[PDB]
Design a protein around this motif. Structure first.
Motif, PDB file in Angstrom:
ATOM      1  N   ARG A  57       0.807  -1.223   0.000  1.00 55.02           N
ATOM      2  CA  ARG A  57       0.000   0.000   0.000  1.00 55.02           C
ATOM      3  C   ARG A  57       0.836   1.267   0.000  1.00 55.02           C
ATOM      4  N   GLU A  58       1.845   1.316   0.880  1.00 55.65           N
ATOM      5  CA  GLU A  58       2.778   2.459   0.920  1.00 55.65           C
ATOM      6  C   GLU A  58       3.358   2.715  -0.479  1.00 55.65           C
ATOM      7  N   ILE A  59       3.761   1.644  -1.149  1.00 55.21           N
ATOM      8  CA  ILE A  59       4.340   1.728  -2.500  1.00 55.21           C
ATOM      9  C   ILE A  59       3.349   2.314  -3.509  1.00 55.21           C
ATOM     10  N   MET A  89      13.809   4.782  -2.914  1.00 55.46           N
ATOM     11  CA  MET A  89      13.520   6.222  -2.806  1.00 55.46           C
ATOM     12  C   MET A  89      14.767   7.074  -3.008  1.00 55.46           C
ATOM     13  N   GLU A  90      14.550   8.330  -3.386  1.00 59.45           N
ATOM     14  CA  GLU A  90      15.663   9.243  -3.621  1.00 59.45           C
ATOM     15  C   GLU A  90      16.465   9.406  -2.332  1.00 59.45           C
ATOM     16  N   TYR A  91      17.789   9.395  -2.458  1.00 58.30           N
ATOM     17  CA  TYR A  91      18.643   9.615  -1.311  1.00 58.30           C
ATOM     18  C   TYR A  91      18.813  11.108  -1.122  1.00 58.30           C
ATOM     19  N   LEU A  92      18.440  11.607   0.057  1.00 62.12           N
ATOM     20  CA  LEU A  92      18.628  13.012   0.404  1.00 62.12           C
ATOM     21  C   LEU A  92      19.750  13.139   1.438  1.00 62.12           C
ATOM     22  N   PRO A  93      20.964  13.572   1.018  1.00 59.50           N
ATOM     23  CA  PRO A  93      22.124  13.599   1.925  1.00 59.50           C
ATOM     24  C   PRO A  93      22.026  14.517   3.160  1.00 59.50           C
ATOM     25  N   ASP A 154       8.699   9.737   5.193  1.00 58.14           N
ATOM     26  CA  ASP A 154       8.097   8.536   5.793  1.00 58.14           C
ATOM     27  C   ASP A 154       6.563   8.360   5.678  1.00 58.14           C
ATOM     28  N   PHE A 155       6.143   7.790   4.540  1.00 65.55           N
ATOM     29  CA  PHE A 155       4.743   7.469   4.261  1.00 65.55           C
ATOM     30  C   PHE A 155       4.333   6.050   4.715  1.00 65.55           C
ATOM     31  N   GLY A 156       5.142   5.435   5.588  1.00 65.24           N
ATOM     32  CA  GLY A 156       4.902   4.095   6.129  1.00 65.24           C
ATOM     33  C   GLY A 156       3.619   3.877   6.902  1.00 65.24           C
TER      34      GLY A 156
HETATM   35  C1  LIG Z   1      13.399   4.860   1.899  1.00 61.52           C
HETATM   36  C2  LIG Z   1      12.434   5.028   3.127  1.00 61.52           C
HETATM   37  C3  LIG Z   1      11.348   6.061   2.896  1.00 61.52           C
HETATM   38  C4  LIG Z   1      10.014   5.662   2.852  1.00 61.52           C
HETATM   39  C5  LIG Z   1       9.008   6.579   2.578  1.00 61.52           C
HETATM   40  O1  LIG Z   1       7.700   6.173   2.538  1.00 61.52           O
HETATM   41  C6  LIG Z   1       9.328   7.910   2.347  1.00 61.52           C
HETATM   42  C7  LIG Z   1      10.651   8.320   2.394  1.00 61.52           C
HETATM   43  C8  LIG Z   1      11.671   7.411   2.688  1.00 61.52           C
HETATM   44  C9  LIG Z   1      13.040   7.932   2.943  1.00 61.52           C
HETATM   45  C10 LIG Z   1      13.555   7.928   4.241  1.00 61.52           C
HETATM   46  C11 LIG Z   1      14.800   8.452   4.530  1.00 61.52           C
HETATM   47  C12 LIG Z   1      15.574   9.004   3.512  1.00 61.52           C
HETATM   48  C13 LIG Z   1      16.855   9.660   3.436  1.00 61.52           C
HETATM   49  C14 LIG Z   1      17.744   9.799   4.617  1.00 61.52           C
HETATM   50  O2  LIG Z   1      17.496   9.199   5.647  1.00 61.52           O
HETATM   51  N1  LIG Z   1      18.872  10.511   4.431  1.00 61.52           N
HETATM   52  C15 LIG Z   1      19.972  10.644   5.316  1.00 61.52           C
HETATM   53  C16 LIG Z   1      21.140  11.234   4.859  1.00 61.52           C
HETATM   54  C17 LIG Z   1      22.241  11.320   5.692  1.00 61.52           C
HETATM   55  C18 LIG Z   1      22.165  10.804   6.986  1.00 61.52           C
HETATM   56  C19 LIG Z   1      23.310  10.915   7.948  1.00 61.52           C
HETATM   57  N2  LIG Z   1      21.038  10.225   7.440  1.00 61.52           N
HETATM   58  C20 LIG Z   1      19.978  10.172   6.626  1.00 61.52           C
HETATM   59  N3  LIG Z   1      17.081   9.995   2.156  1.00 61.52           N
HETATM   60  N4  LIG Z   1      16.006   9.591   1.429  1.00 61.52           N
HETATM   61  C21 LIG Z   1      15.066   8.999   2.201  1.00 61.52           C
HETATM   62  C22 LIG Z   1      13.812   8.468   1.906  1.00 61.52           C
END
Ligand SMILES: CCc1cc(O)ccc1-c1ccc2c(C(=O)Nc3ccc(C)nc3)n[nH]c2c1
Length: 291
Positions: A57-59, A89-93, A154-156
């Motif tokens: 569902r989250e997906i 998901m996109e990595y946000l640094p 976090d849409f979990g």
């Molecule tokens: C994949 C899980 C998810 C599930 C959802 O439904 C919505 C968003 C996300 C999600 C959660 C966290 C992040 C992050 C991050 O945690 N970034 C970071 C960067 C650096 C450090 C130190 N810690 C942390 N980047 N993209 C993210 C996407």
């Protein structure tokens, strides 16, 4: 363009984890030369059929969402089947707003806090158009793209309102972020746009404490409950305190108009809480009057 295989995902570091799932920083490297894109990958630990369904569902919720102030969906890894899915998901640094604010508090004034606040309101507004209730609004679940842009993440826990009802009742809740929860969410497990508005009030509180540990919602609520905790649970004590119009105090520094918005969001009556559109309009105008 959304087909991610398991053999190409490389572990870099763990970003965070919980009781049933984890979030890792991975590189998707199909050309195996480490030039591939860095992504955030969610997976589950011990999965039951309904935990699997929640994740599915989250997906689906994440698939339909495209907005500047919502974290970007990339895809799913189907390689191990339905039983062991990975969410890409996109990595946000810059990480969570909670951590980012603590770290950069000296260069984040009130005008900037309101910039972030109205981006959250516009994101939440867009969510409402699809009948999505977030259920987990908190600065820890808001992510930072840069100094001028935040994104709801976090849409979990996110749910979809029925077509004919304005609330969604959760039949089996686990550990809940109770110090962000509206009274009706605590007493009746009922979640709506109005419960998200309550939670947004707490997020606004969070922003104006500058994430000071001693002033966090758990810290202040436990202080307000008192040392005479004998005879009943914490949630029970919180329910009575909220019923008696006990509220999070105004941070000494917070503008009165901002604290007013909080207390309006913290109305006991779901039908008397402001709308996210109104919240955006009121925040933009206070921000305009500051500079
Ligand atoms: C994949 C899980 C998810 C599930 C959802 O439904 C919505 C968003 C996300 C999600 C959660 C966290 C992040 C992050 C991050 O945690 N970034 C970071 C960067 C650096 C450090 C130190 N810690 C942390 N980047 N993209 C993210 C996407």
């Amino acid at each position: 363009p959304t087909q991610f295989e398991e053999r190409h995902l490389k572990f870099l570091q763990q970003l965070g984890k919980g009781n049933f799932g984890s979030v890792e920083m991975c590189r998707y490297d199909p050309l195996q030369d480490n030039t591939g894109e860095v992504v955030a990958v969610k997976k589950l630990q011990h999965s039951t059929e309904e935990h699997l369904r929640d994740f599915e569902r989250e997906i689906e919720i994440l698939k339909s969402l495209q907005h500047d102030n919502i974290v970007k969906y990339k895809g799913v890894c189907y390689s191990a089947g339905r039983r062991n899915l990975k969410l890409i998901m996109e990595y946000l640094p810059y990480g969570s707003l909670r951590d980012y604010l603590q770290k950069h508090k000296e260069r984040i004034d009130h005008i900037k806090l309101l910039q972030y606040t109205s981006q959250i309101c516009k994101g939440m507004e867009y969510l409402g158009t699809k009948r999505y209730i977030h259920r987990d609004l908190a600065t820890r679940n808001i992510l930072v793209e840069n100094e001028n842009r935040v994104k709801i993440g976090d849409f979990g826990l996110t749910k979809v309102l029925p077509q004919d009802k304005e609330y969604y009742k959760v039949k089996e809740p686990g550990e809940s972020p109770i110090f962000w929860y509206a009274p009706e969410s605590l007493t009746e497990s009922k979640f709506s746009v109005a419960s998200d508005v309550w939670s947004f009030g707490v997020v606004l509180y969070e922003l104006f404490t500058y994430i000071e540990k001693s002033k966090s919602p758990p810290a202040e609520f436990m202080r307000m409950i008192g040392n005479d905790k004998q005879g009943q649970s914490i949630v029970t004590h919180l329910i009575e305190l909220l019923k008696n119009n006990g509220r999070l105090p105004r941070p000494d520094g917070c503008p009165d108009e901002i604290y007013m918005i909080m207390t309006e969001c913290w109305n006991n009556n779901v039908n008397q809480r402001p709308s996210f559109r109104d919240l955006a309009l009121r925040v933009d105008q206070i921000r305009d009057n500051m500079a």
